Each structure stands twice: as structure tokens, then as C-alpha cells.
Design an enzyme around this catalytic site. Structure first.
Site, PDB file in Angstrom:
ATOM      1  N   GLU A  24       8.365  -0.698  -6.684  1.00 35.68           N
ATOM      2  CA  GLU A  24       7.163   0.098  -6.499  1.00 35.68           C
ATOM      3  C   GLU A  24       7.395   1.515  -6.990  1.00 35.68           C
ATOM      4  OE1 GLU A  24       4.829  -0.242  -2.927  1.00 35.68           O
ATOM      5  OE2 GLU A  24       3.663   1.549  -3.446  1.00 35.68           O
TER       6      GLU A  24
HETATM    7  C1  LIG Z   1      -7.146   2.206  -1.114  1.00 29.73           C
HETATM    8  C2  LIG Z   1      -6.701   2.857  -2.416  1.00 29.73           C
HETATM    9  C3  LIG Z   1      -5.884   1.952  -3.225  1.00 29.73           C
HETATM   10  C4  LIG Z   1      -7.909   3.272  -3.229  1.00 29.73           C
HETATM   11  O1  LIG Z   1      -9.009   2.314  -3.082  1.00 29.73           O
HETATM   12  P1  LIG Z   1     -10.458   2.775  -2.500  1.00 29.73           P
HETATM   13  O2  LIG Z   1     -10.870   1.915  -1.377  1.00 29.73           O
HETATM   14  O3  LIG Z   1     -11.577   2.489  -3.499  1.00 29.73           O
HETATM   15  O4  LIG Z   1     -10.475   4.346  -2.036  1.00 29.73           O
HETATM   16  P2  LIG Z   1     -11.096   4.864  -0.640  1.00 29.73           P
HETATM   17  O5  LIG Z   1     -11.410   6.305  -0.702  1.00 29.73           O
HETATM   18  O6  LIG Z   1     -12.419   4.340  -0.409  1.00 29.73           O
HETATM   19  O7  LIG Z   1     -10.095   4.518   0.564  1.00 29.73           O
HETATM   20  C5  LIG Z   1     -10.008   5.464   1.639  1.00 29.73           C
HETATM   21  C6  LIG Z   1      -8.568   5.642   2.109  1.00 29.73           C
HETATM   22  O8  LIG Z   1      -7.644   5.396   1.010  1.00 29.73           O
HETATM   23  C7  LIG Z   1      -6.758   6.569   0.957  1.00 29.73           C
HETATM   24  N1  LIG Z   1      -7.012   7.327  -0.177  1.00 29.73           N
HETATM   25  C8  LIG Z   1      -8.124   7.290  -0.926  1.00 29.73           C
HETATM   26  N2  LIG Z   1      -8.027   8.141  -1.955  1.00 29.73           N
HETATM   27  C9  LIG Z   1      -6.795   8.773  -1.865  1.00 29.73           C
HETATM   28  C10 LIG Z   1      -6.119   9.784  -2.658  1.00 29.73           C
HETATM   29  N3  LIG Z   1      -6.733  10.340  -3.806  1.00 29.73           N
HETATM   30  N4  LIG Z   1      -4.897  10.171  -2.260  1.00 29.73           N
HETATM   31  C11 LIG Z   1      -4.299   9.663  -1.181  1.00 29.73           C
HETATM   32  N5  LIG Z   1      -4.881   8.722  -0.417  1.00 29.73           N
HETATM   33  C12 LIG Z   1      -6.139   8.263  -0.744  1.00 29.73           C
HETATM   34  C13 LIG Z   1      -7.043   7.361   2.242  1.00 29.73           C
HETATM   35  O9  LIG Z   1      -6.131   6.988   3.263  1.00 29.73           O
HETATM   36  C14 LIG Z   1      -8.397   6.994   2.584  1.00 29.73           C
HETATM   37  O10 LIG Z   1      -8.627   7.090   4.044  1.00 29.73           O
HETATM   38  P3  LIG Z   1      -9.914   7.837   4.590  1.00 29.73           P
HETATM   39  O11 LIG Z   1     -11.173   7.243   4.060  1.00 29.73           O
HETATM   40  O12 LIG Z   1      -9.915   7.834   6.184  1.00 29.73           O
HETATM   41  O13 LIG Z   1     -10.005   9.203   4.045  1.00 29.73           O
HETATM   42  C15 LIG Z   1      -5.774   4.098  -2.176  1.00 29.73           C
HETATM   43  O14 LIG Z   1      -6.608   5.176  -1.885  1.00 29.73           O
HETATM   44  C16 LIG Z   1      -4.736   3.933  -1.080  1.00 29.73           C
HETATM   45  O15 LIG Z   1      -5.048   4.040   0.067  1.00 29.73           O
HETATM   46  N6  LIG Z   1      -3.318   3.686  -1.365  1.00 29.73           N
HETATM   47  C17 LIG Z   1      -2.407   3.559  -0.225  1.00 29.73           C
HETATM   48  C18 LIG Z   1      -1.179   4.527  -0.269  1.00 29.73           C
HETATM   49  C19 LIG Z   1       0.001   4.190  -1.113  1.00 29.73           C
HETATM   50  O16 LIG Z   1       0.135   3.040  -1.604  1.00 29.73           O
HETATM   51  N7  LIG Z   1       1.008   5.188  -1.377  1.00 29.73           N
HETATM   52  C20 LIG Z   1       2.113   4.860  -2.185  1.00 29.73           C
HETATM   53  C21 LIG Z   1       1.800   5.268  -3.688  1.00 29.73           C
HETATM   54  S1  LIG Z   1       2.887   4.431  -4.806  1.00 29.73           S
END
Ligand SMILES: CC(C)(COP(=O)(O)OP(=O)(O)OC[C@H]1O[C@@H](n2cnc3c(N)ncnc32)[C@H](O)[C@@H]1OP(=O)(O)O)[C@@H](O)C(=O)NCCC(=O)NCCS
Ligand SMILES: CC(C)(COP(=O)(O)OP(=O)(O)OC[C@H]1O[C@@H](n2cnc3c(N)ncnc32)[C@H](O)[C@@H]1OP(=O)(O)O)[C@@H](O)C(=O)NCCC(=O)NCCS
Lengths: 121, 121, 120, 121
Positions: free
Chosen positions: B45
Site C-alpha cells: 500500500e
Molecule cells: C472514501 C474515500 C476513498 C473517498 O471516497 P468518497 O466516498 O467519494 O469521499 P467522501 O467525502 O464522501 O467520504 C467521506 C470520508 O472519507 C474521508 N475523506 C474524504 N475525502 C478526504 C480527503 N481529501 N482527505 C482525507 N480524508 C478524506 C473522510 O474521513 C470523510 O469523512 P467525513 O465525511 O466524516 O468528513 C477516501 O476519502 C477515504 O476515506 N480513504 C481512507 C483513508 C486511507 O486509506 N488513508 C491511507 C492513504 S494510502
């Protein structure tokens, strides 16, 4: 014990088909940005279902080997503790399949996971 | 910082290809113990997250692991493991990566596919 | 349209939840033959996309399956299979769905997780 | 029989390699409609299952799909799609397969990894 020790994991509960393991979100397990590293979360999950499978079999005759792991990262974790709840879906002769949910303090889903553990002679 | 905890070394990076290795030490082993499957996956990852970061403007976008999956093939007990991440698809909003993780003897330890979301900062 | 090919029937829908069935017939079987793993997975992905459609304005957005994974647990030889898709996460650009597919005998046939991208 | 339902054609086979194609018709589309993601995956699972069958004695063993995962990359609206399954790992009790599914324009539609269990009849 040492990856479990490295991540300071604590087994909060075990019973047949259910394992709960928590760990602190510290800098040593963060990504640089930094949130909890997705890989650290997955490692916590794989630990939980591997322990569950070991608890379900005769470990003098069989060994549980992680075969397949998959995961969706949903929310981020910045601090406090994260908790993996592993529940068995299928307890077969040669494979176990596990559902694992990993949550933060605020009861948000950080990572959802499914693990397939091979049961080998 | 997990990169530092696991003593990961970036051996090579170019557009769409990242190679990261790490030593198999007690800190990344299961108790029994071989290399922990979760540590292998975390190496993977890290590699594709780094690759994706290298492909985008990190002053505007952040690469977030979205989905990860992995098959564990062989075990590693000592020496080094090396993750080679090659991009499969460079999309506007998602990247898909193929990752192979091998030991010293060129044995396949873990094969992975990772999906990385490209999200605004 | 595949929905028709497999004779799928929507048994229940509400926000974040879909229950959808189909008959296990020769057209969706393997040669040996059991219910084809791929047919079960197609039922699952159908459940996901329908569920996501119910959650969005489909005059502006389209739900496209982005990632799918599945464990095949038991075989199905006859009768019907029923997929229950319950949403895990409703994000702006992705929805994540948990899917369980059972047979008549209430046996777990296939379990799935689906990530659906929400695209213009 | 699904192979016939989907009008699949086996274009090439050798040990550890399978190529199978099928037409993109209304029978396998989404309502919108492009090629159904499930249909592509079904093609993939067919290809690696055939691959594993070609490696074993099918009067004594049966290849059963155990775990399947897939990333959908591009859509297909017409023409034919072609699945290429190459074996990654040939174990005694499981085979792991890489599957790439492309359209006529040589575009990646679906990338897949399949884990096939080898069970006694
Ligand atoms: C879910 C994800 C893949 C994006 O898909 P999405 O559903 O269309 O985006 P969303 O905004 O609707 O999802 C919301 C949540 O995802 C996370 N998220 C969304 N955008 C983000 C960003 N730009 N930065 C960090 N976290 C984010 C937040 O936790 C958010 O929670 P909240 O709504 O209470 O604020 C991504 O945002 C995510 O959560 N990844 C998980 C963290 C991770 O893997 N970290 C390791 C990186 S290698
Ligand atoms: C789960 C599975 C992969 C084998 O792993 P396992 O859990 O350790 O094997 P188990 O003996 O414990 O599982 C038993 C169940 O799996 C199935 N199964 C087991 N062995 C089987 C075989 N040789 N042939 C067909 N099905 C079998 C049965 O449904 C069985 O149900 P039962 O216990 O009521 O008899 C496999 O048996 C299976 O269920 N495959 C799903 C069907 C499928 O994918 N068909 C399409 C082929 S591509």
C-alpha cells in the site's frame, strides 16, 4: 509476538467466532501526511481473523494461513485508538472466511475488510 | 512514519513504477513467526501510494488508498522483501496498481492490487 | 437487460437497502454444473448499482461498478438465490455496499463487497 | 451453459493460459447501458476456472472459484470483449490467476484476480 507488540495491539475480547483487537494510533503507525496508515489497519484486521481461526481449530494438527485479504478504506484516523471486530462468516473444513470492521473512537468505520484463512494439515 | 518503523527503503521510483523493500525482522513478524501478512500488505500500500503521489500535483490533490486486495502465496522467514508496484490504470479520479512482493530467492510472497483515490486537498 | 436474462426480481427496496432474487436455472449454471460464481457475482453487482441509483439523482449521475470482490462459500444447485445489499458508506464519489447471497435453504452461497463510483 | 448463454468462444488454450471472448450484446448489458460489470467478471471467472480445469484431472478433481476480485476500468458499449487468464501460482489446493479483459480497441475493461480451489469430486 513482535508485530503485535510493535503496533501495541491489545486483545480486548475473544470467543468462538469473534475477535476484538484494538491499538493506539501513534506516529509510528501513521502515513507521513499523516493519518493512520491503511496498511496498519489491514495488519490489525489480518491479526484478528488469524487469531480467530487459530482459536477454532486443533492447532496440534492444523495451521491457519492467511490466504486472501481485501479491504475498503472508508474514513481516516488521526489519534486515539482503533478497534477491529472480526466475526466469522464461514467455518469450513479447509477455509474460514471472516468479516472484519475497523472503527475509530468516534464509532466511524475506518476500514471494512474480508479475510480468507486456509486451514492446512 | 510507518515507512520508518518498518525500515522501508525506496530502491527505485519513476513514473508508474515504484520499488520499495524492507528487511524481515522481528518487528514485522507474526508471533510464530514468519513475516506478518499485514506487514507485506502495508509495504504494498505504501508503494502504490507513493507511486500515485508521484503522478499528481500534491499541492492540489491527495492520494488516498480506496481498496486493497491481496493473495498470500509463500512465506518469508528472513532476508528482505521487495514490493514492485506497476500502474495498470492512471485515471483522473482513481489509479489502479499491480503489486508483487517477492523475497530474496525471487519467490512470490504476496500479490496485490490496489485502488488509489485522487481527492482534492 | 441482464436483469431480464437472469429473471431477477426486486423483493424489497429502501434507502441503503436492496433485496433482489433470481432463479437458479441451466442458463446461469456451469457445465458440471452448479450456479456459476460469475452469475452470483452479477446478481450482487446488480443489487449494488440499483441501490446506488435509489440514492442519487439519476438524471445527473450514473452509478458505475468500480471494484467488486467475492467469496464463494457454498454451491447452489437449484431453486432461487437472494442477494441482500446493504450500504456501508454513502460518499460523494463512491458508495460501498455489503452483499450477502443465500439460497432457498437459507445457506450462504456468496458474500461480496462492492464499490460503486458515482460519475457524471 | 452460461458460456453458451453469454456466447463465449475459447480462442486459445495452453497450460497456464486461457483466452476467451464474447460479444457485447443486449443480453449482457446494464440498462443504461454498457456491458454489465457482472458479465465481464463472469467471463473472467470462466476463463480461470477453465485454466485450472486444463491443469488437473477433472475425473478426480473439480476447480471451484473460491475468491474473485475485480476493478472495472473502462466501459464497453459494443463489439467483443476478450479475457486473458494467466496463472500466477499453481499450488496443490489452490490456483491463483491474473485476468485481463479488453475490448476491440485493445482498451482495459476489467482487471481481475481469481483464486480457484481444487477439490476432490
Ligand atoms: C472514501 C474515500 C476513498 C473517498 O471516497 P468518497 O466516498 O467519494 O469521499 P467522501 O467525502 O464522501 O467520504 C467521506 C470520508 O472519507 C474521508 N475523506 C474524504 N475525502 C478526504 C480527503 N481529501 N482527505 C482525507 N480524508 C478524506 C473522510 O474521513 C470523510 O469523512 P467525513 O465525511 O466524516 O468528513 C477516501 O476519502 C477515504 O476515506 N480513504 C481512507 C483513508 C486511507 O486509506 N488513508 C491511507 C492513504 S494510502
Ligand atoms: C468453499 C469452497 C471454495 C471450498 O472450501 P471449504 O470451505 O474449506 O470446503 P468445505 O467442505 O468446508 O465447504 C462445504 C461446502 O462447500 C461446497 N463444497 C465443498 N466441497 C465441494 C465439492 N467437491 N464440489 C462442490 N461443492 C463443494 C458445498 O456447498 C459444501 O456445503 P455442505 O457442507 O452443506 O456440504 C467450495 O466448496 C465452494 O463452496 N465453492 C462455491 C461454488 C462455486 O464457486 N461454483 C462455481 C465454480 S467456478
Amino acid at each position: 509476538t513482535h508485530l503485535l507488540e510493535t503496533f501495541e495491539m491489545s486483545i480486548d475480547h475473544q470467543e468462538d467466532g469473534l475477535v476484538v483487537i484494538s491499538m493506539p494510533v501513534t506516529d509510528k503507525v501513521k502515513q507521513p501526511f499523516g493519518y493512520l496508515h491503511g496498511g496498519a489497519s489491514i495488519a490489525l484486521g489480518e491479526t484478528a481473523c488469524s487469531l480467530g481461526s487459530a482459536n477454532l481449530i486443533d492447532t496440534t494438527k492444523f495451521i491457519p494461513l492467511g490466504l486472501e485479504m481485501n479491504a475498503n478504506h472508508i474514513h481516516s484516523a488521526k489519534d486515539g485508538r482503533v478497534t477491529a471486530t472480526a466475526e466469522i462468516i464461514h467455518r469450513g473444513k479447509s477455509t474460514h472466511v471472516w468479516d472484519i470492521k475497523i472503527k475509530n473512537d468516534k464509532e466511524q468505520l475506518i476500514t471494512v475488510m474480508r479475510g480468507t484463512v486456509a486451514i492446512k494439515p
